[PDB]
Write an enzyme that holds these catalytic residues in place. Structure first.
Site, short mmCIF file in Angstrom:
data_model
loop_
_atom_site.label_atom_id
_atom_site.label_comp_id
_atom_site.label_asym_id
_atom_site.label_seq_id
_atom_site.Cartn_x
_atom_site.Cartn_y
_atom_site.Cartn_z
N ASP A 121 25.01 -22.91 -57.59
CA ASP A 121 26.29 -23.61 -57.54
C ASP A 121 27.47 -22.95 -58.25
O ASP A 121 28.36 -23.61 -58.78
CB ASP A 121 26.15 -25.04 -58.00
CG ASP A 121 27.27 -25.94 -57.43
OD1 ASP A 121 27.64 -25.82 -56.22
OD2 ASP A 121 27.81 -26.75 -58.22
N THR A 122 27.50 -21.63 -58.26
CA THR A 122 28.64 -20.99 -58.90
C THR A 122 29.24 -20.07 -57.84
O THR A 122 30.22 -20.44 -57.22
CB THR A 122 28.26 -20.24 -60.19
OG1 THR A 122 27.25 -19.28 -59.91
CG2 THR A 122 27.79 -21.24 -61.28
N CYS B 282 29.32 -16.48 -70.11
CA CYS B 282 28.39 -16.42 -68.94
C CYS B 282 27.40 -15.25 -68.98
O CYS B 282 27.80 -14.10 -69.07
CB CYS B 282 29.19 -16.26 -67.61
SG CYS B 282 28.11 -16.33 -66.16
N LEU B 283 26.12 -15.52 -68.88
CA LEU B 283 25.15 -14.43 -68.69
C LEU B 283 24.98 -13.91 -67.25
O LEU B 283 24.42 -12.84 -67.02
CB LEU B 283 23.78 -14.87 -69.20
CG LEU B 283 23.84 -15.11 -70.72
CD1 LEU B 283 22.50 -15.73 -71.02
CD2 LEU B 283 24.05 -13.80 -71.47
N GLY B 284 25.31 -14.73 -66.28
CA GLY B 284 25.19 -14.29 -64.91
C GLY B 284 26.42 -13.63 -64.33
O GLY B 284 26.44 -13.34 -63.10
N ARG C 296 29.13 -31.98 -58.96
CA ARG C 296 30.09 -32.75 -58.10
C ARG C 296 29.44 -34.06 -57.63
O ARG C 296 29.14 -34.18 -56.46
CB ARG C 296 30.55 -31.90 -56.88
CG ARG C 296 31.51 -30.76 -57.23
CD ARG C 296 31.89 -29.86 -56.07
NE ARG C 296 30.66 -29.41 -55.41
CZ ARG C 296 29.87 -28.43 -55.87
NH1 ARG C 296 30.22 -27.68 -56.94
NH2 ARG C 296 28.74 -28.16 -55.21
C1 HEM Z 1 31.31 -17.06 -60.15
C2 HEM Z 1 30.11 -17.38 -60.67
C3 HEM Z 1 30.04 -17.94 -62.04
C4 HEM Z 1 31.03 -18.64 -62.88
C5 HEM Z 1 32.43 -19.09 -62.69
C6 HEM Z 1 30.25 -18.91 -64.09
C7 HEM Z 1 30.84 -19.63 -65.23
C8 HEM Z 1 30.19 -19.86 -66.47
C9 HEM Z 1 30.90 -20.50 -67.61
C10 HEM Z 1 32.31 -21.02 -67.61
C11 HEM Z 1 29.88 -20.55 -68.66
C12 HEM Z 1 30.01 -21.10 -70.07
C13 HEM Z 1 29.85 -22.63 -70.05
C14 HEM Z 1 29.94 -23.27 -71.43
O1 HEM Z 1 30.52 -22.63 -72.34
O2 HEM Z 1 29.44 -24.44 -71.62
C15 HEM Z 1 28.67 -19.94 -68.06
C16 HEM Z 1 27.45 -19.78 -68.80
C17 HEM Z 1 26.20 -19.37 -68.22
N1 HEM Z 1 26.09 -18.95 -66.94
FE1 HEM Z 1 27.60 -18.48 -65.61
N2 HEM Z 1 28.95 -18.54 -64.06
C18 HEM Z 1 28.84 -17.92 -62.88
C19 HEM Z 1 27.61 -17.33 -62.36
C20 HEM Z 1 26.29 -17.49 -62.96
C21 HEM Z 1 25.09 -17.00 -62.26
C22 HEM Z 1 25.02 -16.36 -60.90
C23 HEM Z 1 24.04 -17.30 -63.21
C24 HEM Z 1 22.61 -17.00 -63.10
C25 HEM Z 1 21.93 -16.89 -61.97
C26 HEM Z 1 24.68 -17.90 -64.43
C27 HEM Z 1 23.99 -18.23 -65.68
C28 HEM Z 1 24.74 -18.65 -66.85
C29 HEM Z 1 23.95 -19.01 -68.03
C30 HEM Z 1 22.50 -18.90 -68.21
C31 HEM Z 1 24.96 -19.47 -68.98
C32 HEM Z 1 24.74 -20.02 -70.38
C33 HEM Z 1 25.01 -18.89 -71.38
C34 HEM Z 1 24.77 -19.51 -72.76
O3 HEM Z 1 24.72 -20.73 -72.94
O4 HEM Z 1 24.59 -18.76 -73.69
N3 HEM Z 1 26.10 -18.07 -64.29
N4 HEM Z 1 28.79 -19.63 -66.68
C1 LIG Z 2 18.07 -9.72 -76.72
C2 LIG Z 2 19.51 -9.61 -77.18
O1 LIG Z 2 19.89 -8.56 -77.71
N1 LIG Z 2 20.40 -10.61 -76.99
C3 LIG Z 2 21.59 -10.37 -76.31
C4 LIG Z 2 22.34 -11.49 -75.87
C5 LIG Z 2 23.24 -11.38 -74.78
C6 LIG Z 2 23.43 -10.14 -74.15
C7 LIG Z 2 24.33 -10.02 -73.08
C8 LIG Z 2 24.50 -8.78 -72.45
C9 LIG Z 2 23.75 -7.68 -72.91
C10 LIG Z 2 23.93 -6.43 -72.29
C11 LIG Z 2 23.22 -5.31 -72.71
C12 LIG Z 2 22.33 -5.44 -73.79
C13 LIG Z 2 22.16 -6.66 -74.43
C14 LIG Z 2 21.28 -6.74 -75.50
C15 LIG Z 2 21.10 -7.97 -76.10
C16 LIG Z 2 21.79 -9.11 -75.67
C17 LIG Z 2 22.70 -9.01 -74.62
C18 LIG Z 2 22.86 -7.79 -73.99
C1 LIG Z 3 29.24 -24.72 -66.68
C2 LIG Z 3 28.20 -23.87 -65.92
C3 LIG Z 3 28.88 -23.11 -64.74
C4 LIG Z 3 27.37 -22.97 -66.83
C5 LIG Z 3 26.44 -22.40 -65.80
C6 LIG Z 3 26.04 -23.62 -64.92
C7 LIG Z 3 27.02 -24.66 -65.46
C8 LIG Z 3 27.34 -25.77 -64.43
C9 LIG Z 3 26.38 -25.05 -66.77
O1 LIG Z 3 25.72 -26.08 -67.02
C10 LIG Z 3 26.57 -23.89 -67.76
#
Ligand code: HEM
Ligand SMILES: CC(=O)Nc1ccc2ccc3cccc4ccc1c2c34
Ligand SMILES: CC1(C)[C@@H]2CC[C@@]1(C)C(=O)C2
Ligand SMILES: [K+]
Ligand SMILES: [K+]
Length: 411
Positions: free
Chosen positions: A249-250, A355-357, A184
């Site tokens: 920030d989510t 999303c992983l989180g 933002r």
């Molecule tokens: C309400 C809370 C949350 C919302 C709405 C949210 C939303 C999203 C969305 C829309 C994406 C995909 C973005 C894209 O495709 O470019 C994403 C990816 C991701 N988010 Fe979340 N998020 C949330 C919480 C979190 C938290 C708490 C963490 C970690 C502390 C997190 C870590 C990630 C990461 C690492 C990815 C990248 C996954 C990838 O590129 O493979 N997020 N998030």
């Molecule tokens: C290390 C790897 O397998 N890459 C993977 C990428 C993303 C994940 C997201 C959610 C997951 C839940 C439980 C097991 C998972 C295994 C592997 C995962 C993966 C898991």
């Molecule tokens: C779009 C997102 C919510 C996702 C997690 C943080 C964020 C701002 C990114 O850059 C990837």
């Protein structure tokens, strides 16, 4: 309306037909005072095409309907994550891992990021999450008032995250400011500058933690293996930057939308008070109605998509927030109904960067709702307060002054 009347509009590129123009500004949508989700949903009114070009923020496409948002997020071959933020300068500087990489190269980094924020981590931390939510809420309860954004919505998720990352709580103001300039921007710091400042913070920590690791998320990342080799310091830095932004920030913004809704809707509160077991399904419905993320992709080649000629290098905003507000995904989408048979949304993204989180986010939301509604079942907006939202890559609530009668509260 013309570049003459609004110096921030970019000249229409020659491949864009005039009937596709709709000058929506994702960082200041004209309808913002009705609420942020409402401001975005004007893109779904009957006068707006499925796919529109805005001349704001440098000029870019916006897909407006869940089907197109989902298709584009699936098709990474045409729609690349290499530049996933608007404006173009920010997308070009964005170099976080795994989010800036297309399949199949995001794979190993997605693997490693999952090890530090995924479900086993959330379960290990659940007691700590309940502990902090209970402690903050008990401390607010006898007061009859709070500034929700700063008394709970920020410190609750952020302290959990800094605990997970092994970072001191006194660095919060510094990091939060930077993460917020990325999503933002107030206009005083470019994305590149905010990233460079986040990276300058992280670089000495990552070195320390490759020399003397702990058990924290940063030490796990910085000492991982990817692609058959040790991760480099620079790769670990590009991953940790992203982790900080998701941590700070989510959920922080989402909790304010939800609590604002609950303050404004006694009937919905009453339904969760009377049936606590409904809290997880209610959380999902809130995650739909108060969805808040909008990033996008960049065109890897010319490509005709739904009858619209897209050119290579054209940016496309694919608002995650909009899929579940789409009346084609959910009937009466602006109404909150905790008993919807299917809560269709793309709040956590879609496809390979899903999303992983999200599991950390759901636990935090669920724990917040259960503990708040147990101790402070009855609250409302401070009388005379009019709630303002803010808009960007992640949308937010500027201030949420709440009030209650302490006599109504419980232990
Ligand atoms: C309400 C809370 C949350 C919302 C709405 C949210 C939303 C999203 C969305 C829309 C994406 C995909 C973005 C894209 O495709 O470019 C994403 C990816 C991701 N988010 Fe979340 N998020 C949330 C919480 C979190 C938290 C708490 C963490 C970690 C502390 C997190 C870590 C990630 C990461 C690492 C990815 C990248 C996954 C990838 O590129 O493979 N997020 N998030
Ligand atoms: C290390 C790897 O397998 N890459 C993977 C990428 C993303 C994940 C997201 C959610 C997951 C839940 C439980 C097991 C998972 C295994 C592997 C995962 C993966 C898991
Ligand atoms: C779009 C997102 C919510 C996702 C997690 C943080 C964020 C701002 C990114 O850059 C990837
Ligand atoms: K980039
Ligand atoms: K429907």
């Amino acid at each position: 309306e013309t570049i003459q009347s609004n110096a921030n509009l970019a000249p229409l590129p020659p491949h864009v037909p005039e009937h596709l123009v709709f000058d929506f500004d994702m960082y200041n949508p004209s309808n913002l005072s009705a609420g942020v989700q409402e401001a975005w949903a004007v893109l779904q009114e009957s006068n707006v095409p499925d796919l529109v070009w805005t001349r704001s923020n440098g000029g870019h496409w916006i897909a407006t309907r869940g089907q197109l948002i989902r298709e584009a997020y699936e098709d990474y071959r045409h729609f690349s994550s290499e530049s996933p933020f608007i404006p173009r300068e920010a997308g070009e500087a964005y170099d976080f891992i795994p989010t800036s990489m297309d399949p199949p190269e995001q794979r190993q980094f997605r693997c490693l990021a999952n090890q530090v924020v995924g479900m086993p981590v959330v379960d290990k931390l659940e007691n700590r999450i309940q502990e902090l939510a209970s402690s903050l809420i008990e401390s607010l309860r006898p007061q009859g008032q709070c500034n929700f954004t700063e008394d709970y919505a920020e410190p609750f998720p952020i302290r959990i995250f800094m605990l997970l990352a092994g970072l001191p709580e006194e660095d919060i103001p510094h990091l939060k400011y930077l993460t917020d300039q990325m999503t933002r921007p107030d206009g005083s710091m470019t994305f590149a500058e905010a990233k460079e400042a986040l990276y300058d913070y992280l670089i000495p920590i990552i070195e320390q933690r490759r020399q003397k690791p702990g058990t924290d998320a940063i030490s796990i990342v910085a000492n991982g293996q990817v692609n058959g080799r040790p991760i480099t310091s620079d790769e670990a830095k590009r991953m940790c930057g992203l982790l900080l932004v998701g941590g700070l920030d989510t959920v922080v913004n989402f909790l304010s939308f939800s609590m604002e809704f609950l303050a404004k809707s006694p009937e919905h509160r009453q339904e969760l008070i009377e049936r606590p077991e409904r809290i997880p399904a209610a959380s999902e419905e809130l995650l739909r109605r108060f969805s808040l993320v909008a990033d996008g992709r960049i065109l890897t080649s010319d490509y005709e998509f739904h009858g619209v000629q897209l050119k290579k290098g054209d940016q496309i905003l694919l608002p995650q927030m909009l899929s579940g507000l789409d009346e084609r995904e959910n009937a009466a989408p602006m109404h909150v109904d905790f008993s919807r048979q299917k809560v269709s949304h793309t709040t956590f993204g879609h496809g390979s960067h899903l999303c992983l989180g999200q599991h950390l986010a759901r636990r935090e939301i669920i724990v917040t709702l259960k503990e708040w509604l147990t101790r402070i079942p009855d609250f409302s907006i401070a009388p005379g307060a009019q709630i303002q939202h803010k808009s960007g890559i992640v949308s937010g609530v500027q201030a949420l002054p709440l009030v209650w009668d302490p006599a109504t509260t419980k232990a």
